[PDB]
Amino acid sequence: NRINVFKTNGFSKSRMTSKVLVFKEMATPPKSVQDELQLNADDTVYYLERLRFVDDDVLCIEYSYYHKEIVKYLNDDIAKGSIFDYLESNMKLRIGFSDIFFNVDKLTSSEASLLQLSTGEPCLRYHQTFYTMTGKPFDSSDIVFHYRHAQFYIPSK
Amino acid sequence: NRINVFKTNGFSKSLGRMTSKVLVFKEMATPPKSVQDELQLNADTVYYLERLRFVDDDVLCIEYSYYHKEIVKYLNDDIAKGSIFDYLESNMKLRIGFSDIFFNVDKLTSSEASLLQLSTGEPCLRYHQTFYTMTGKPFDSSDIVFHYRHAQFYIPSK
Ligand SMILES: [Zn+2]
Ligand SMILES: [Zn+2]
Numbered sequence: 001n002r003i004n005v006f007k008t009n010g011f012s013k014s015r016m017t018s019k020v021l022v023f024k025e026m027a028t029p030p031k032s033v034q035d036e037l038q039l040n041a042d043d044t045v046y047y048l049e050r051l052r053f054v055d056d057d058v059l060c061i062e063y064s065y066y067h068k069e070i071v072k073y074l075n076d077d078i079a080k081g082s083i084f085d086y087l088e089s090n091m092k093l094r095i096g097f098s099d100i101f102f103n104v105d106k107l108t109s110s111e112a113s114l115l116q117l118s119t120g121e122p123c124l125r126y127h128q129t130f131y132t133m134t135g136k137p138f139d140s141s142d143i144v145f146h147y148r149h150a151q152f153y154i155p156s157k
Numbered sequence: 158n159r160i161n162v163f164k165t166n167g168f169s170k171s172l173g174r175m176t177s178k179v180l181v182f183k184e185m186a187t188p189p190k191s192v193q194d195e196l197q198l199n200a201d202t203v204y205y206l207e208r209l210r211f212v213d214d215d216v217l218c219i220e221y222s223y224y225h226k227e228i229v230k231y232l233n234d235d236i237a238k239g240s241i242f243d244y245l246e247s248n249m250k251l252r253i254g255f256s257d258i259f260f261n262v263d264k265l266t267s268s269e270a271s272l273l274q275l276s277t278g279e280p281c282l283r284y285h286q287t288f289y290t291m292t293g294k295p296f297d298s299s300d301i302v303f304h305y306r307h308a309q310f311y312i313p314s315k
Binding site: 128 | 159162163164165255256257258259260261262263264279280281282303305308309310311312313314315
């Protein structure tokens with residue numbers, strides 16, 4: 001079947017499973033992450049690196065930064081499941097909207113390796129920044145999709 | 158600068174800038190099988206066109222479209238040089254309701270690579286859109302193959 005983007009959800013809400021590769025709390029976020037999440041050097045982010053699968057096929061690598069203040073608490077156990085359901089059901093976080101950017105590109109050497117493909121084959125680069133309902137950014141995510149396993153859909157109006 | 162999909166109009170209305178070169182325009186008394194299926198037709202005439210599209214003299218995509226003649230009423234290759242969707246709303250007064258969009262990433266065929274001035278096998282976006290009138294009548298089946306460098310997308314999600 002097919003991934004739906006319209007959806008500000010987790011992918012979990014489109015079957016899915018995950019290898020968490022990194023989870024950590026960073027005292028000083030990357031400068032890109034400071035910009036994107038309207039942060040400074042001082043306030044903490046969580047970083048999460050996940051390999052996602054759909055029905056046993058590698059779907060993408062996901063690079064996520066979360067604003068600890070807004071999200072309140074994450075750990076790698078909870079990173080094994082749906083972050084979005086944890087956020088709504090446990091943390092009771094009111095997620096409002098999101099900006100999505102994407103383009104097609106060639107894979108890097110290491111990316112082709114992660115996604116068991118060859119250097120330079122196609123991929124989709126997908127960025128998403130999630131906002132709370134009061135406009136505060138809390139999640140900046142970058143995904144590189146496996147070009148044969150990722151199929152997308154959207155309904156317009 | 159960035160192409161919005163959200164957003165059920167033509168690309169001329171979507172961004173700009175846009176110009177296009179019409180490569181093929183046929184009126185077909187017998188539409189292909191999947192076009193019958195998809196436009197929910199009899200074996201009903203459709204117009205077929207291939208269009209090579211540019212934003213600012215940069216090649217953006219190749220467009221392969223089928224239109225239901227009965228709903229669209231009339232189309233020729235001149236009208237096809239400009240915004241087909243403005244013609245449809247401004248002239249034909251067609252009420253456009255909604256659309257289904259499908260996309261995936263793939264490699265280019267040699268004939269697509271030539272048209273987009275890239276190499277056989279280099280990446281693209283294959284994008285499909287089916288448009289329906291405001292009464293749920295499907296009237297346009299479109300496949301687009303995007304230039305992977307020149308096309309950069311945006312969704313304002315909620
Ligand atoms: Zn999730
Ligand atoms: Zn148009």
